[PDB]
């Protein structure tokens, strides 16, 4: 068997090739206890990784080792990898090849260090490095389409017409859910609720996943919200306090299409789709219009596809038809596609050998993997 | 004859337009007796506000109507304004427009209430509500520069470039002098000194304002402070008993840079100032580096500018020259900057009219004030 690990900005999954569901589901955060140990009865480990931290997240300094799809802290990163293989997946890395996924347009130092770690720390028999978004299209059973990946650190748009994607039309935007989490909280201060620390940030993360939704008409909906009622919902905080949120339910998800609220000049997520498809050939444009695919945990908002379809329709000429594909389980499409690719017999020749890494060092990843 | 009143968490200043110093300088506390009156000859009142409470603070239960720049008691909030206009200023607000100040990132209901109460209880001709940090730069006379307003309850930092503000890069810290009073009082106990009641907070407020100071190198100093007694200073309490403080003189202001002592996970004032300008783009960072402005009564500490310039120098690139602007009168910069705005001829068009408030209501302030 071959192991599939898909490191994400906030959420990392792992499982086995051919499986329909990832085996391990825990967020990728390592925290260190700011307070001093008083009791000696228990272990009181130096650090905690994954679901272990969130259980005790009140007394930990939660840190995200990867930011915008870039591993800022390599010292913490191996802690997740060690935890994945021995605690969650409880398997020995030196018997099975493992595959890792990355966002496009990443620094060369990001994806050279992981190969060094894999062949020196865990001594995996083989390795592979594959773009995050391209694997999502495999999960949908298509090879000609454009994938709208939107996770926590990267929102990259890539058109894929054949078995390989076009690098020249890859547009990467650093606007994702984590920026959204930073955005509702500053707006949430308008209603009298203050959340500053990283511990309450996950509490902030929860409310977005449950109550935030995309409004079809932002101008009409805000006018509707001016009349009060019929939209405010009550949410219970882990403390026990119940909070009510009004217009902010749609305002934060709306920032995807109008980034002017967050203060960066890049256009909305609807607009960058149009730019990418302009950069490709005219003949391939027709196919990509009808094969638009959404992916990533950000795209989970209710009605996001309907508003997306409306926006691109205005920008696109009426001759070509736009069909947006939103599979129900697009949350794990990146991993699921990797399981299919790992299960393929043709892929036995695109593995990287340990001996081959020795001859070329960690620089072999640029030339072989893509 | 516009009125310039800048209500603060602990200190409020009231004066007239076109002047150089605030007319009325009294503490912002409303207190009520905890006992029952015995002598009927003396005309006991119900509650006492301002310096009158400070005179009889040993018998009253002092309470701050404003906490963290937020009015938690609107009933008491009217009382202080009632005392300002008719006792301190001795003028009628019905014929002059009045300008009011507030910290950024405050709940909209807070500024909603102030407009309603002043237009309905005092019935002024006009109002304008403006950010405290914004008014600070006017006193300096500059047009671009990062302003660090560390008041009593709110520590906020706002970048400005050529008169254009950046709402996204505004950072607010809820750590200011009042918290330092709480930190100073817990660290005085190790020498054997107990201060618990609210009346005993003011005496602690007095001790920091004269003896506490900022040390350039904290790590160097405690070894010096623990090796001799030259740093010890003697202070006399109003009851005649005399106080000696050693290493605690620099330790309390050190919490402004190391909030881990207070248990807060926020970054230090030097770090937050660095963090705020990192949120800004590269182009204005050079100019904003050379125009750092400090304000608020917390920044009164001797040697604070030398420590802040040293701390930012390590974080900032070595090529840049960091310039700390510390005008000697920066305690009253917010009010003095307010005197300029009320005296400006262009500002007369941005006054909120009674007719404008009549047709819309308290909600007019949100679209008419920043």
């Amino acid at each position: 068997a071959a192991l599939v690990v898909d490191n994400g900005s906030g959420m990392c999954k792992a499982g086995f090739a051919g499986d329909d569901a990832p085996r391990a589901v825990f967020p990728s955060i390592v925290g260190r206890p700011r307070h001093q140990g008083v009791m000696v009865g228990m272990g009181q480990k130096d650090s905690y990784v994954g679901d272990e931290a969130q259980s005790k997240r009140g007394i930990l300094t939660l840190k995200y080792p990867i930011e915008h799809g870039i591993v800022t802290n390599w010292d913490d990163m191996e802690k997740i990898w060690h935890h994945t293989f021995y605690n969650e997946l409880r398997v020995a890395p030196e018997e099975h090849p493992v595959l890792l996924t990355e966002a496009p347009l990443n620094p060369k130092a990001n994806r050279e260090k992981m190969t060094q770690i894999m062949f020196e720390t865990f001594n995996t028999p083989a390795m592979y490095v594959a773009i995050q978004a391209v694997l999502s299209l495999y999960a949908s059973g298509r090879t000609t389409g454009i994938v709208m990946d939107s996770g926590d650190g990267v929102t990259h748009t890539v058109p894929i017409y054949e078995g390989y994607a076009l690098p020249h039309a890859i547009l990467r935007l650093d606007l994702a859910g984590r920026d959204l989490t930073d955005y509702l909280m500053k707006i949430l201060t308008e209603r009298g609720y203050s959340f500053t620390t990283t511990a309450e940030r996950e509490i902030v993360r929860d409310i977005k996943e449950k109550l935030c939704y995309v409004a079809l008409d932002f101008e009409q909906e805000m006018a509707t919200a001016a009349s009060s009622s019929s939209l405010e919902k009550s949410y219970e905080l882990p403390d026990g306090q119940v909070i009510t949120i009004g217009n902010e339910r749609f305002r934060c998800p709306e920032a995807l299409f109008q980034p002017s609220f967050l203060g960066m000049e890049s256009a909305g997520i609807h607009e960058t789709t149009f730019n990418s498809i302009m950069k490709c050939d005219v003949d391939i444009r027709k196919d990509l219009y009808a094969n638009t695919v959404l992916s990533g945990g950000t795209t989970m908002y209710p009605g996001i596809a309907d508003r997306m379809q409306k926006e691109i329709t205005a920008l696109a000429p009426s001759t070509m038809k736009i069909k947006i594909i939103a599979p129900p389980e697009r949350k794990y499409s990146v991993w699921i596609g990797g399981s299919i690719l790992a299960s393929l017999s043709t892929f036995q020749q695109m593995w990287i050998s340990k001996q081959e890494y020795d001859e070329s060092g960690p620089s072999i990843v640029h030339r072989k993997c893509f | 004859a516009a009125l310039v009143v800048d209500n603060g968490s602990g200190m409020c200043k009231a004066g007239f337009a076109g002047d150089d110093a605030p007319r009325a300088v009294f503490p912002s506390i409303v207190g009520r007796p905890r006992h029952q009156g015995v002598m009927v000859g003396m005309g006991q009142k119900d509650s006492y506000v301002g310096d009158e409470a400070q005179s009889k603070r040993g018998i009253l239960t002092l309470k701050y109507p404003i906490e963290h720049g937020i009015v938690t008691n609107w009933d008491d909030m009217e009382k202080i304004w009632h005392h300002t206009f008719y006792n301190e200023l001795r003028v009628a607000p019905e014929e002059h427009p009045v300008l009011l100040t507030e910290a950024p990132l405050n709940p909209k209901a807070n500024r909603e209430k102030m407009t309603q109460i002043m237009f309905e209880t005092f019935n002024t001709p006009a109002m304008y509500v403006a950010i405290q940090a914004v008014l600070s730069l006017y006193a300096s006379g500059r047009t671009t520069g990062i302003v660090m307003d560390s008041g009593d309850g709110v520590t906020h930092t706002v970048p400005i470039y050529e008169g254009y503000a950046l709402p996204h890069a505004i950072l607010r810290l809820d750590l200011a002098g009042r918290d330092l009073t709480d930190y100073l009082m817990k660290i005085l106990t190790e020498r054997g000194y107990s201060f618990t009641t609210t009346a005993e907070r003011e005496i602690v407020r007095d001790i920091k304002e004269k003896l506490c100071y900022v040390a350039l190198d904290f790590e160097q100093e405690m070894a010096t402070a623990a090796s001799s007694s030259s740093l010890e200073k003697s202070y006399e309490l109003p009851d005649g008993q005399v106080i000696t403080i050693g290493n605690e003189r620099f330790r309390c202001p050190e919490a402004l840079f190391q909030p881990s002592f207070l248990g807060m996970e926020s970054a230090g004032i030097h770090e937050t100032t660095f963090n705020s300008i990192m949120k800004c783009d590269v182009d204005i960072r050079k100019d904003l580096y050379a125009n750092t402005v400090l304000s608020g009564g917390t920044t009164m500490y001797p040697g604070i500018a030398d420590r802040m310039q040293k701390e930012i120098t390590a974080l900032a690139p070595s090529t840049m020259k960091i310039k700390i602007i510390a005008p000697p009168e920066r305690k009253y910069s917010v009010w003095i900057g307010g005197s300029i705005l009320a005296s400006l001829s262009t500002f007369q068009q941005m006054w909120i009219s009674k007719q404008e408030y009549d047709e819309s209501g308290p909600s007019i302030v949100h679209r008419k004030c920043f």
């Binding site: 930011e67 915008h68 870039i70 800022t72 650190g153 650093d174 | 990192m278 590269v282």
Partner: peptide, 7 residues
């Protein structure tokens, strides 16, 4: 990042 953003 090194030159740009926080990463």
């Amino acid at each position: 990042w090194x030159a740009x953003c926080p990463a």
